[PDB]
Structures are given as C-alpha cells and as structure tokens.
A paper describes a structure:
Centrioles have proximal-distal polarity and a 9-fold radial symmetry imparted by a likewise symmetrical central scaffold, the cartwheel. The spindle assembly abnormal protein 6 (SAS-6) self-assembles into 9-fold radially symmetric ring-shaped oligomers that stack via an unknown mechanism to form the cartwheel. SAS-6 proteins comprise a globular “head” domain at their N-terminus followed by a long coiled coil that mediates stable protein homo-dimerization (Keller et al., 2014), and a disordered C-terminal extension. The characteristic shape of the SAS-6 ring led to the proposal that the protein head domains comprise the central “hub” of the centriolar cartwheel, with SAS-6 coiled coils forming the cartwheel “spokes” (Cottee et al., 2015; Kitagawa et al., 2011; van Breugel et al., 2011; van Breugel et al., 2014; Yoshiba et al., 2019).
Recombinantly produced fragments of the corresponding coiled-coil domains were folded, as judged by thermal denaturation experiments monitored by circular dichroism (CD) spectroscopy, and formed dimers in solution size exclusion chromatography–multiangle light scattering (SEC-MALS) assays. We succeeded in crystalizing a fragment of the coiled-coil domain from each species, with different boundaries, but spanning approximately the middle one-third of this protein region (henceforth, CrSAS-6_CCMiddle, DrSAS-6_CCMiddle, and HsSAS-6_CCMiddle; see Figure S2A for the protein sequence alignment, Table 1 for a list of recombinant protein constructs, and Figure S1A for SDS-PAGE analysis of these constructs). As the HsSAS-6_CCMiddle and DrSAS-6_CCMiddle fragments did not originally include methionine residues, one or two amino acids, respectively, were mutated to methionine to allow SeMet incorporation. All three SAS-6 structures revealed two-stranded parallel coiled-coil domains as analyzed by SOCKET, in agreement with the predicted nature of this protein section. Only parallel associations between coiled-coil domains are compatible with the stacking of SAS-6 rings into a continuous cartwheel, whereas antiparallel coiled-coil interactions would lead to horizontal displacement of SAS-6 rings, a distribution incompatible with a stacked rings configuration. Both the HsSAS-6_CCMiddle and DrSAS-6_CCMiddle crystal structures revealed primarily antiparallel associations between their coiled coils, with only much smaller parallel associations between coiled-coil copies, which were offset by approximately one-half length or the full length of the crystallographic c-axis, respectively. A previous hypothesis posited that STIL/SAS-5/Ana2, an essential centriolar component that forms higher-order oligomers (Cottee et al., 2015; David et al., 2016; Rogala et al., 2015; Shimanovskaya et al., 2013) and binds to SAS-6 (Dzhindzhev et al., 2014; Hilbert et al., 2013; Ohta et al., 2014; Qiao et al., 2012), could cross-link SAS-6 copies, thereby stabilizing SAS-6 oligomer formation and their 3D arrangement.
Numbering used by the authors:
A (entry chain D): 12 to 108
B (entry chain A): 10 to 109
Write the structure that this text describes.
C-alpha cells in the first residue's frame, strides 16, 4: 500500500542527487574543453609561425648559396689574374739577362 | 493517509527526471567525445611543432655554415685583390725606371 510510495521516494531523491552531479560534470567538461581549444589554437599558431620561419631560412640559404657560387667564380678569376701577372713579371726578369 | 495520489504524482515526477537524465547523459557522452578528438588534435600539432623545430635547427645550422664559408671567401677575395694591386704597382715602378 504505502510501501510503493517509499520505493518511489528513494528513486526520486536518487534522480535529483544524480542531476546535481551530472550538471557539475557538464560545467567541468565545458571548462576543460575551453582550455583545450585555447591550447590547440596556440599550437596551430606555433606551427604556422614555425612554417613561416622555415620558409624564411630556406630563402636565406638559397641567397647565401647564390652569393657563394658568385664568390667562388670571382676567386678563380683573381687566381688566374695573379698567375698571368707573375708570368709577365717572370718574362721581364728573363729578358734582363 | 487513505489516498495513493502521491504515487501518481511521484511517478509523473520520476518519469520526467528519467527522460531529462537521458538528455543530460548524451550531452556528457557528446562533450567527452568532442574532447577526445580535441586531445588527439592537440597531440598531432605537438608532434608537428616538434618536427618543425628539428627542421628549423637544421636550417639554422646550414645558414650558419653558408655564412661562415662566405666570410672566408670575402676575406680570400680581399687578399687576392691586394696581391694584384702590389704586383701591378711593382710593374708600374719598373715601367717608370725604364722611362727615367
């Protein structure tokens, strides 16, 4: 009789107490997620920053190499100019005999 | 205490809580799933950052060696350009004596 009233009072008090717990779980999950998407956004910007830095270094390595081949060519030209001038200095010394 | 109207009221209150509990549970299941993908996404960008930091250190060392060989060459050019000037001046002074 009044027996089923008690089984139902326990069931209700249990549901309301579970509703408090589920609500705080939702509040906690939403907060744990806000920090997480702020973290993911930070690393996305960090990746993009590092990709820009890498492109910059790549272009810089290209220019350095371009300038280097130019200097190696310049050295070869000057090294030959020396050889030709030393030989001219040698032939002048040789004629004064 | 002769009326079970509290049963009819306690059953309409309970069935309403049970239906709300289904909705709250799927919200929790959906938040937990949205978070698992997000944690996986963050882990993927962490490895992408680390990969890009390795790559950056490599390019930096490479740019440093290129800059080092360039300073060496610029110095070499200056030495050779001076050797030329000194030899041309010797050739000039010999020409000058052969005139006087």
């Amino acid at each position: 009789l009044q027996t089923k009233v008690s089984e139902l009072e326990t069931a209700n008090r249990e549901l309301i107490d579970k509703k408090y717990k589920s609500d705080s779980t939702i509040r906690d999950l939403k907060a744990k997620m806000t920090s997480l998407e702020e973290e993911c956004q930070r690393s996305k910007q960090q990746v993009l920053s590092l990709r820009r830095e890498n492109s910059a270094l790549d272009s810089e390595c290209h220019e350095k190499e371009r300038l280097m081949n130019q200097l190696q060519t310049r050295v070869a030209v000057l090294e030959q100019e020396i050889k030709d001038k030393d030989q001219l200095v040698l032939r002048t010394k040789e004629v004064l005999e």
